[PDB]
Curated annotation (Swiss-Prot):
Alphabetical list of NCBIfam families matching this protein: rocF_arginase
GO biological process assignments: adaptive immune response; arginine catabolic process to ornithine; arginine metabolic process; cellular response to dexamethasone stimulus; cellular response to glucagon stimulus; cellular response to hydrogen peroxide; cellular response to interleukin-4; cellular response to lipopolysaccharide
Consequence recorded when altering D227A: Loss of one manganese ion and strongly reduced catalytic activity
Protein name: Arginase-1
Residues that bear Phosphoserine: S57, S67, S158, S212
Similarity-based family: Belongs to the arginase family.
Region annotated Disordered, chain positions: 1-22
Recorded catalytic activity of this chain's protein: L-arginine + H2O = urea + L-ornithine
Subunit structure, as described in the record: Homotrimer. Interacts with CMTM6.
GO cellular component entries: cytoplasm; cytosol; extracellular space; mitochondrial outer membrane; neuronal cell body
Length: 314
């Protein structure tokens, strides 16, 4: 199965800058070359060039609405195209607002997809509930069908059509949810495993339940949107919104290892790696190494080891 790497050096989803350097940081570590060592054929689409919308005035509280809207519309088109050719899309973030385009485009070809969102946050604030107006904190609000019409049409997002229903997404890692967001996930009946559930059940039982919920009645494509801040800051410090008490390095790899084993991974997002936020050079190396390890894990690398078939190593 073919893999297509798509860089999304974008940071307008936040007031903070720097995450747009994430793709370069990941590639510098050799991510693309390492992926070619897996059983997958790899193609690099390169990094998309985003056109900045001049005089991009704030829509009420929402910041850079048109720029974020345009960037995501372009990304959706690219992902839709790669998905059409039967390849697995791998989006290298900037900010999580790019999930709007990534998931929307993926949904165009695979409308029955299931989303597994690993994040310390729900990123489900709407233009009306957000306290900051940062779109990187509102991706899911633009993707859910249940929230259509729950907020005013934001400039630059007219091309968007709610891809999935609240019943097709599972959150893992939650620990920093706004009151508005909490009201939304409870009201919509969204399935989630906050750190509380991870502590109670263990990551093993968590993945079992995640698959039974999403794949119990029907097997379908999986889109894994991974925000590096889902892991504890001691593992992924170079990120914009670190929150103590996160998933461990081991737990993160367990998630990707189990997803690989389903054979259903169809789209992947590796987001929020901000190279400019490490307190030291090493903190950046640590964050990048973790993101790279997670990506390779999603594509077959197992901690127990790997070896090529039809090869007599003895
Ligand atoms: Mn996020
Ligand atoms: Mn987050």
């Amino acid at each position: 199965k073919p893999i297509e790497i798509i860089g999304a050096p974008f940071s307008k989803g936040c007031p903070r800058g720097g995450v747009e350097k994430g793709p370069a940081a990941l590639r510098k570590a050799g991510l693309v070359e390492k992926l070619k060592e897996t059983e997958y054929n790899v193609r690099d689409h390169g990094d998309l060039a985003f056109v900045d919308v001049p005089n991009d005035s704030p829509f009420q509280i929402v910041k850079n609405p048109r720029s974020v809207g345009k960037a995501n519309e372009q990304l959706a088109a690219v992902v839709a195209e790669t998905q059409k050719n039967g390849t697995i899309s791998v989006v290298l973030g900037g900010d999580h607002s790019m999930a709007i385009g990534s998931i929307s485009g993926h949904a165009r070809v695979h409308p029955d997809l299931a989303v597994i969102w690993v994040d310390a946050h729900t990123d489900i604030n709407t233009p009306l509930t957000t306290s900051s107006g940062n779109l990187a904190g509102q991706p899911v609000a633009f993707l859910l069908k249940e929230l259509k019409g729950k907020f005013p049409d934001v400039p630059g997002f007219s091309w968007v059509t709610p891809a999935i229903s609240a019943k097709d997404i599972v959150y893992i890692g939650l620990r920093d949810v706004d009151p508005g967001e909490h009201y939304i996930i409870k009201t919509l009946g969204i399935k989630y495993f906050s750190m509380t559930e991870v502590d109670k059940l263990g990551i093993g039982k968590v993945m079992e339940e995640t698959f039974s919920y999403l794949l119990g009645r029907k097997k379908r494509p999986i889109h894994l949107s991974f925000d590096v801040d889902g892991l504890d800051p001691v593992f992924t410090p170079a990120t914009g919104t670190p929150v103590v008490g996160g998933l461990s390095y081991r737990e993160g790899l367990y998630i990707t290892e189990e997803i690989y084993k389903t054979g259903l991974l169809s789209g992947l997002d590796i987001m929020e790696v901000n190279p400019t936020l490490g307190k030291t050079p090493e903190e950046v190396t640590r964050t990048v190494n973790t993101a790279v390890a997670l990506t390779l894990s999603a594509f077959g690398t197992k901690r127990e080891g790997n070896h090529k078939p039809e090869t007599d190593y003895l």
